[PDB]
Amino acid sequence: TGDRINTVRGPITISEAGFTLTHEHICGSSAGFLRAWPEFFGSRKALAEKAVRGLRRARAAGVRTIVDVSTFDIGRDVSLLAEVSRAADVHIVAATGLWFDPPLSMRLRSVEELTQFFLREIQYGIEDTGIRAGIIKVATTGKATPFQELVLKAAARASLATGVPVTTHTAASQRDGEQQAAIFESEGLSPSRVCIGHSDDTDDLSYLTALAARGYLIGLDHIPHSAIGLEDNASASALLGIRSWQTRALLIKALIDQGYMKQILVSNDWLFGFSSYVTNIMDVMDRVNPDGMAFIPLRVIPFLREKGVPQETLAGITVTNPARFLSPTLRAS
Amino acid sequence: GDRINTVRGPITISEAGFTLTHEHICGSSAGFLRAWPEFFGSRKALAEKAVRGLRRARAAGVRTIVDVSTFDIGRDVSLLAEVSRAADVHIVAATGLWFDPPLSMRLRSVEELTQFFLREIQYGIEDTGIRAGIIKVATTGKATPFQELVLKAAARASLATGVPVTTHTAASQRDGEQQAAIFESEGLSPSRVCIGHSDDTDDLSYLTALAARGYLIGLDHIPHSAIGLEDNASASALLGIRSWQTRALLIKALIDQGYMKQILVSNDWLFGFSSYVTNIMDVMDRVNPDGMAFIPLRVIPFLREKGVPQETLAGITVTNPARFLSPTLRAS
Numbered sequence A: 001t002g003d004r005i006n007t008v009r010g011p012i013t014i015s016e017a018g019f020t021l022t023h024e025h026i027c028g029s030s031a032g033f034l035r036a037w038p039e040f041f042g043s044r045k046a047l048a049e050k051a052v053r054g055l056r057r058a059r060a061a062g063v064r065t066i067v068d069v070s071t072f073d074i075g076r077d078v079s080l081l082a083e084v085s086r087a088a089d090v091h092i093v094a095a096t097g098l099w100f101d102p103p104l105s106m107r108l109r110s111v112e113e114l115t116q117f118f119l120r121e122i123q124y125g126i127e128d129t130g131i132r133a134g135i136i137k138v139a140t141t142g143k144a145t146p147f148q149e150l151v152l153k154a155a156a157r158a159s160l161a162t163g164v165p166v167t168t169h170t171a172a173s174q175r176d177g178e179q180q181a182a183i184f185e186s187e188g189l190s191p192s193r194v195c196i197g198h199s200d201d202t203d204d205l206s207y208l209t210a211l212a213a214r215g216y217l218i219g220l221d222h223i224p225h226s227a228i229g230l231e232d233n234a235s236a237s238a239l240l241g242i243r244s245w246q247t248r249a250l251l252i253k254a255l256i257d258q259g260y261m262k263q264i265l266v267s268n269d270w271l272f273g274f275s276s277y278v279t280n281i282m283d284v285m286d287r288v289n290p291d292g293m294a295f296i297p298l299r300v301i302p303f304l305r306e307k308g309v310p311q312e313t314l315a316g317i318t319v320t321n322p323a324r325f326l327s328p329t330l331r332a333s
Numbered sequence B: 001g002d003r004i005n006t007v008r009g010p011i012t013i014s015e016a017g018f019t020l021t022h023e024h025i026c027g028s029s030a031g032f033l034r035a036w037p038e039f040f041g042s043r044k045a046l047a048e049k050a051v052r053g054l055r056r057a058r059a060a061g062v063r064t065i066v067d068v069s070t071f072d073i074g075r076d077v078s079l080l081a082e083v084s085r086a087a088d089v090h091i092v093a094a095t096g097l098w099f100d101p102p103l104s105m106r107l108r109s110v111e112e113l114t115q116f117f118l119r120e121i122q123y124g125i126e127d128t129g130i131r132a133g134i135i136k137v138a139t140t141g142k143a144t145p146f147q148e149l150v151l152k153a154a155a156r157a158s159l160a161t162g163v164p165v166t167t168h169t170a171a172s173q174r175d176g177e178q179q180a181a182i183f184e185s186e187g188l189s190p191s192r193v194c195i196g197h198s199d200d201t202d203d204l205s206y207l208t209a210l211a212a213r214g215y216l217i218g219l220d221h222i223p224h225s226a227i228g229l230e231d232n233a234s235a236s237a238l239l240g241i242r243s244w245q246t247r248a249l250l251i252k253a254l255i256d257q258g259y260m261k262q263i264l265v266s267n268d269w270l271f272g273f274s275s276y277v278t279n280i281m282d283v284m285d286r287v288n289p290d291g292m293a294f295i296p297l298r299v300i301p302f303l304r305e306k307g308v309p310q311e312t313l314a315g316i317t318v319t320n321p322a323r324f325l326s327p328t329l330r331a332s
């Protein structure tokens, strides 16, 4: 098990991670977008300042590290991550992998080539910065496309060679997690190296627990996502859902109750800029959840405690689980 | 418009000289080159390859090239500026959107896209101050809803700035007709537009009817041929099975029908190409070792041999590009 986690400011020891949000973003965009059209966000400086305010408030609430799951295709700008991390004094773990908007240069690649690209970002550094990714993000939106199966396979190969974990975006509704697990296992990846994300997007407790029993980490990262009260905004309802934050949060207690407290990872899946959706989605979202990344520690944790979840289980979920997941871990020979 | 914007700054119209109007330093994807430069060996190797090729094209008489790589073709203006300076060849950069826009672009309105194109033309690309001198758009058969928005924004940006629009077409499907209709619906003058990849079709009637309306016809795929590589499906699909002589003859055909002033010729070459199968670059380089120098070293002489006069060849390679590139607003 690795003693250090790579962050945008360099390696940190496992104990330095502390309370960690495992699925967040500084900015949800597209490759090259922030640099070619920063004005879409007011300005690069305005976006950085917003991110610094948010990260400082989240830090005030106890968050010590966030995992920015923005891949190349989410328009991840590591320089921006490094700048905000330093200004707000919050650890930020960067990601490699590919989401669902890969451009042609990526979509035409073989599993072997993609493996090399993920390894480059983890081992040598993203772009020419030397900033090394500490996680691999992948995704499916229903049955995987042929390209998506290749990405999952490359992600598994990169994880097996480096020990860095894999985290995913799923259509929880469709039970994407099972197909994802299938692919990963076909590559020999240990389930403990994988977090099946957006799992609170569904009430299927059956699905969730079956994956947990196999060793997978379950990502309940859309807790504050809700279009309740905005049933009239189609784009918003489509993205956020009509289930309440309490409904989603209750899934955490359910999994704990079923005996899988060690496999749960909680997050907000928040961001400070969002260009890969309708214009104005950021504003809508910020009105929905003004606490932003602080929602987890300020609302969710107290809610669960009020529901009977003990202190130690809450601490285990927010500190222990993320540390074990993030610690680079190679499969035993 | 007395000046054309290049990656090294503005040049007078006369300084453009012999110009290739549809080329690329590298055919890629947004952020690709910076994130995975080893795909091309290294950024340095790519730059060096580009400088060698531009120097050879320059030796053959090329003074300027128009790199029609848009944001989504992975245009890296810093690379363009570096190679332009090292080889001493003017390079005109482009704005616009090709056929691989990411979500952040695909979800935008015509109004939003218009401001993005204007940003690139008027103020500068990224934080470099390098201003685009052309707008590139594309369709591959009937336009998608998004492509119609892109074409409309391109026309709006062209009307406000005077910079021309150039396109990628599925020529055999007559895309230029729909493109022209959309452009015309926005009030853009056909003389501000080049319907590209026109040599991909043998339908002279389609080409002369567009010429007749005032559009520029881009015969920019001259050296593209898979003749001899039938066995290579990817190469075949990309380059076609028509010879370079057959395509070059369309230049003569258009001249013979009276449209010499509406012809733009190029090679549609590149030094790196990641937006297709791996190894396509090597295959292409074997097919056409002359690369960008193909037009001046083989096509011009071929046309001359076929009877095209000196003056017409000079007009097509110098005059036409100058007229097209000179920013021109619609009269009031």
Ligand SMILES: OCCc1ccccc1
Pocket: A052, A053, A054, A056, A057
């Ligand atoms: O507008 C400044 C508000 C702010 C102050 C300090 C840290 C986060 C928020």
Ligand SMILES: OCCc1ccccc1
Pocket: A261, A262, A263, A312, A313, A314, A315, A316, A317, A320, A321
């Ligand atoms: O030892 C049990 C402490 C703990 C509880 C919840 C999740 C991880 C660790």
Ligand SMILES: OCCc1ccccc1
Pocket: B260, B261, B311, B312, B313, B314, B315, B316, B319, B320
């Ligand atoms: O008569 C003008 C000379 C000329 C020839 C071909 C194209 C542009 C100009």
Ligand code: NA
Pocket: A006, A122, A123, A132, A133, A162
């Ligand atoms: Na590493």
Ligand code: NA
Pocket: B005, B121, B122, B123, B131, B132, B161
């Ligand atoms: Na300009």
